[PDB]
Scaffold this active site. Structure first.
Site, PDB file in Angstrom:
ATOM      1  N   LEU A  81       2.647  17.289 -30.971  1.00  0.00           N
ATOM      2  CA  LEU A  81       3.494  18.209 -30.206  1.00  0.00           C
ATOM      3  C   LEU A  81       4.679  18.683 -31.035  1.00  0.00           C
ATOM      4  O   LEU A  81       5.106  19.832 -30.916  1.00  0.00           O
ATOM      5  CB  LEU A  81       4.008  17.537 -28.928  1.00  0.00           C
ATOM      6  CG  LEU A  81       2.959  17.160 -27.880  1.00  0.00           C
ATOM      7  CD1 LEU A  81       3.576  16.287 -26.787  1.00  0.00           C
ATOM      8  CD2 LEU A  81       2.319  18.396 -27.283  1.00  0.00           C
ATOM      9  N   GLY A  82       5.217  17.796 -31.865  1.00  0.00           N
ATOM     10  CA  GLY A  82       6.357  18.138 -32.699  1.00  0.00           C
ATOM     11  C   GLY A  82       6.720  17.070 -33.709  1.00  0.00           C
ATOM     12  O   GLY A  82       6.046  16.046 -33.825  1.00  0.00           O
ATOM     13  N   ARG A  83       7.802  17.328 -34.435  1.00  0.00           N
ATOM     14  CA  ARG A  83       8.269  16.460 -35.506  1.00  0.00           C
ATOM     15  C   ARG A  83       9.726  16.771 -35.825  1.00  0.00           C
ATOM     16  O   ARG A  83      10.160  17.922 -35.731  1.00  0.00           O
ATOM     17  CB  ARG A  83       7.407  16.667 -36.759  1.00  0.00           C
ATOM     18  CG  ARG A  83       7.977  16.077 -38.053  1.00  0.00           C
ATOM     19  CD  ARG A  83       6.982  16.219 -39.194  1.00  0.00           C
ATOM     20  NE  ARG A  83       7.555  15.885 -40.499  1.00  0.00           N
ATOM     21  CZ  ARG A  83       6.885  15.935 -41.652  1.00  0.00           C
ATOM     22  NH1 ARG A  83       5.603  16.301 -41.683  1.00  0.00           N
ATOM     23  NH2 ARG A  83       7.499  15.615 -42.787  1.00  0.00           N
ATOM     24  N   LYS A  95      13.442  14.785 -38.086  1.00  0.00           N
ATOM     25  CA  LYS A  95      13.916  13.867 -39.121  1.00  0.00           C
ATOM     26  C   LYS A  95      13.530  12.410 -38.841  1.00  0.00           C
ATOM     27  O   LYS A  95      13.188  11.668 -39.762  1.00  0.00           O
ATOM     28  CB  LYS A  95      15.443  13.977 -39.255  1.00  0.00           C
ATOM     29  CG  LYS A  95      16.076  12.998 -40.241  1.00  0.00           C
ATOM     30  CD  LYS A  95      17.571  13.250 -40.402  1.00  0.00           C
ATOM     31  CE  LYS A  95      18.243  12.138 -41.201  1.00  0.00           C
ATOM     32  NZ  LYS A  95      17.624  11.957 -42.546  1.00  0.00           N
ATOM     33  N   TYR A  96      13.577  12.016 -37.570  1.00  0.00           N
ATOM     34  CA  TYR A  96      13.466  10.608 -37.181  1.00  0.00           C
ATOM     35  C   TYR A  96      12.126  10.219 -36.552  1.00  0.00           C
ATOM     36  O   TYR A  96      11.861   9.029 -36.363  1.00  0.00           O
ATOM     37  CB  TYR A  96      14.597  10.260 -36.205  1.00  0.00           C
ATOM     38  CG  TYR A  96      15.978  10.500 -36.779  1.00  0.00           C
ATOM     39  CD1 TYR A  96      16.505   9.649 -37.748  1.00  0.00           C
ATOM     40  CD2 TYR A  96      16.752  11.582 -36.364  1.00  0.00           C
ATOM     41  CE1 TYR A  96      17.770   9.864 -38.285  1.00  0.00           C
ATOM     42  CE2 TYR A  96      18.020  11.807 -36.895  1.00  0.00           C
ATOM     43  CZ  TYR A  96      18.522  10.943 -37.855  1.00  0.00           C
ATOM     44  OH  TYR A  96      19.774  11.161 -38.389  1.00  0.00           O
ATOM     45  N   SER A  97      11.290  11.201 -36.218  1.00  0.00           N
ATOM     46  CA  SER A  97      10.041  10.913 -35.510  1.00  0.00           C
ATOM     47  C   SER A  97       9.004  12.033 -35.566  1.00  0.00           C
ATOM     48  O   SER A  97       9.288  13.164 -35.975  1.00  0.00           O
ATOM     49  CB  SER A  97      10.338  10.594 -34.038  1.00  0.00           C
ATOM     50  OG  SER A  97      10.815  11.740 -33.345  1.00  0.00           O
ATOM     51  N   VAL A 116       5.897  13.361 -32.704  1.00  0.00           N
ATOM     52  CA  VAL A 116       5.606  13.230 -31.285  1.00  0.00           C
ATOM     53  C   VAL A 116       4.224  13.772 -30.958  1.00  0.00           C
ATOM     54  O   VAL A 116       3.854  14.874 -31.388  1.00  0.00           O
ATOM     55  CB  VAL A 116       6.669  13.955 -30.429  1.00  0.00           C
ATOM     56  CG1 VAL A 116       6.298  13.890 -28.962  1.00  0.00           C
ATOM     57  CG2 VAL A 116       8.040  13.332 -30.659  1.00  0.00           C
ATOM     58  N   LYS A 128       5.981   8.829 -29.200  1.00  0.00           N
ATOM     59  CA  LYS A 128       6.943   9.158 -30.233  1.00  0.00           C
ATOM     60  C   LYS A 128       6.887   8.043 -31.263  1.00  0.00           C
ATOM     61  O   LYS A 128       7.306   6.917 -30.980  1.00  0.00           O
ATOM     62  CB  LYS A 128       8.343   9.260 -29.615  1.00  0.00           C
ATOM     63  CG  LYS A 128       9.487   9.545 -30.584  1.00  0.00           C
ATOM     64  CD  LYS A 128      10.828   9.469 -29.841  1.00  0.00           C
ATOM     65  CE  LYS A 128      11.955  10.132 -30.611  1.00  0.00           C
ATOM     66  NZ  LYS A 128      13.216  10.181 -29.806  1.00  0.00           N
ATOM     67  N   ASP A 161      23.101  15.201 -28.063  1.00  0.00           N
ATOM     68  CA  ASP A 161      22.166  16.182 -28.637  1.00  0.00           C
ATOM     69  C   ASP A 161      21.574  17.047 -27.531  1.00  0.00           C
ATOM     70  O   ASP A 161      20.368  17.288 -27.490  1.00  0.00           O
ATOM     71  CB  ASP A 161      21.061  15.481 -29.451  1.00  0.00           C
ATOM     72  CG  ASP A 161      20.344  16.423 -30.416  1.00  0.00           C
ATOM     73  OD1 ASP A 161      20.879  17.514 -30.706  1.00  0.00           O
ATOM     74  OD2 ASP A 161      19.236  16.071 -30.885  1.00  0.00           O
TER      75      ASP A 161
HETATM   76  O1  LIG Z   1      12.330  11.405 -26.366  1.00  0.00           O
HETATM   77  C1  LIG Z   1      11.912  12.134 -27.555  1.00  0.00           C
HETATM   78  C2  LIG Z   1      11.410  13.557 -27.201  1.00  0.00           C
HETATM   79  C3  LIG Z   1      10.373  14.109 -28.206  1.00  0.00           C
HETATM   80  N1  LIG Z   1       9.550  15.269 -27.734  1.00  0.00           N
HETATM   81  N2  LIG Z   1       9.339  16.264 -28.444  1.00  0.00           N
HETATM   82  N3  LIG Z   1       8.618  17.106 -27.889  1.00  0.00           N
HETATM   83  C4  LIG Z   1       8.281  16.655 -26.682  1.00  0.00           C
HETATM   84  C5  LIG Z   1       7.503  17.163 -25.635  1.00  0.00           C
HETATM   85 BR1  LIG Z   1       6.652  18.876 -25.780  1.00  0.00          BR
HETATM   86  C6  LIG Z   1       7.363  16.387 -24.472  1.00  0.00           C
HETATM   87 BR2  LIG Z   1       6.324  17.000 -23.011  1.00  0.00          BR
HETATM   88  C7  LIG Z   1       7.979  15.136 -24.355  1.00  0.00           C
HETATM   89 BR3  LIG Z   1       7.751  14.129 -22.741  1.00  0.00          BR
HETATM   90  C8  LIG Z   1       8.752  14.658 -25.418  1.00  0.00           C
HETATM   91 BR4  LIG Z   1       9.600  12.978 -25.307  1.00  0.00          BR
HETATM   92  C9  LIG Z   1       8.902  15.415 -26.577  1.00  0.00           C
END
Ligand SMILES: OCCCn1nnc2c(Br)c(Br)c(Br)c(Br)c21
Ligand SMILES: [Cl-]
EC number: 2.7.11.1
Length: 325
Positions: A39-41, A43-45, A47, A62, A150
């Protein structure tokens, strides 16, 4: 400088509550979860959309990148403290890789629609409704002695179909203790309060309220981000062009804040602007006297004079949301 509200919250609770470095999470097995899609990325993680194999439920995993375990303990303890909080993302599990022992956090899934597409189609009521939901989360975490630090569109998941909102990514969040100096390298450039940009470390929950004010402004005016700095220096310039330069210096004088001498080159002279100046034909339907009054009481230099989340929730702007219940 002291927070107006919830200031002694943590000192009145058990040390265990805020002493996150002594927290020992129970780390389960990541084998329970099947990764489906990135779903994403950051610096720290990184997802991932995932499936809980036992109950077949969709979740988000995550995976935490190599940082000091102190920061991992902080995030996990903050999430445990905020469990059951209104509009706070629910932590379902804390698990580890069965071979590398890499920690991962498991969250509830939310069918999020990205703010770029969403914010263009929000009605006046939608903005009121989602700002209210977001304020519920901020009042809640502030009441639990926690600053998010944040707050930005990327950290607010909105299911526009089911009208659900969750404040996510508590990886920068911290416990508020009166008189504690905090690192000003928090938040994302466009949502950094003036206090961060002038290196004032004695900040508090009101930081999050500046960030929320930035979001409100982008939603009602459709300039996103509202304050679009090219760097941390220019960010303050963008703000001062609206809020005014003499008002900035008045703020710095009050709290005895030293201004980085590089600002002398770029800050210039700017009078405070009327919020009505940002109205035009494409955003007129989103702006009301009530909306501008609220915004004016959020986007203030003086972090102690900004509305608390509760005061903002009580503002007439949200009356149509409360009436609808
Ligand atoms: O708490 C770290 C958040 C990281 N993070 N990045 N993209 C996300 C999406 Br799209 C969903 Br849906 C959820 Br739920 C979270 Br969690 C997501
Ligand atoms: Cl800090």
């Amino acid at each position: 400088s002291r927070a107006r509200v919830y200031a002694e919250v943590n000192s009145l609770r058990s040390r265990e509550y805020w002493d996150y470095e002594a927290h020992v999470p129970s780390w389960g097995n990541q084998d329970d979860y099947q990764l489906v899609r990135k779903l994403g990325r950051g610096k720290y993680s990184e997802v991932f959309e995932a499936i809980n194999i036992t109950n077949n439920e969709r979740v988000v995993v995550k995976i935490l990148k190599p940082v000091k375990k102190k920061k991992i303990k902080r995030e996990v303890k903050i999430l445990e403290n905020l469990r059951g909080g209104t509009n706070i993302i629910k932590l379902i599990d804390t698990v580890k890789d069965p071979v590398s022992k890499t920690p991962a956090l498991v969250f509830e899934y939310i069918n999020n629609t990205d703010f770029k597409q969403l914010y263009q189609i929000l009605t006046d009521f939608d903005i009121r409704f989602y700002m209210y939901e977001l304020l519920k989360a901020l009042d809640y975490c502030h009441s639990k002695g926690i600053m998010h630090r944040d707050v930005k569109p990327h950290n607010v998941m909105i299911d526009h179909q089911q009208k659900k909102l969750r404040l996510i990514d508590w990886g920068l969040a911290e416990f508020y203790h009166p008189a504690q100096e905090y690192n000003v390298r928090v938040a994302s450039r466009y949502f950094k309060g003036p206090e961060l940009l002038v290196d004032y470390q004695m900040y508090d929950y009101s930081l999050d309220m500046w960030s929320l004010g930035c979001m409100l402004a982008s939603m009602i005016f459709r300039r996103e981000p509202f304050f679009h700095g090219q760097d941390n220096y220019d960010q303050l310039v963008r703000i001062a062009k609206v809020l005014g330069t003499e008002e900035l210096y008045g703020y710095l004088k009050k709290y005895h804040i030293d201004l980085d001498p590089h600002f002398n080159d770029i800050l210039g002279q700017h009078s405070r602007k009327r919020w009505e100046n940002f109205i035009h034909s494409e955003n007129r339907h989103l702006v009301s006297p009530e909306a501008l009054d609220l915004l004016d009481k959020l986007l203030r230099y003086d972090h102690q004079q900004r509305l608390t989340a509760k005061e903002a929730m009580e503002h007439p702007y949200f009356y149509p949301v409360v009436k609808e219940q």
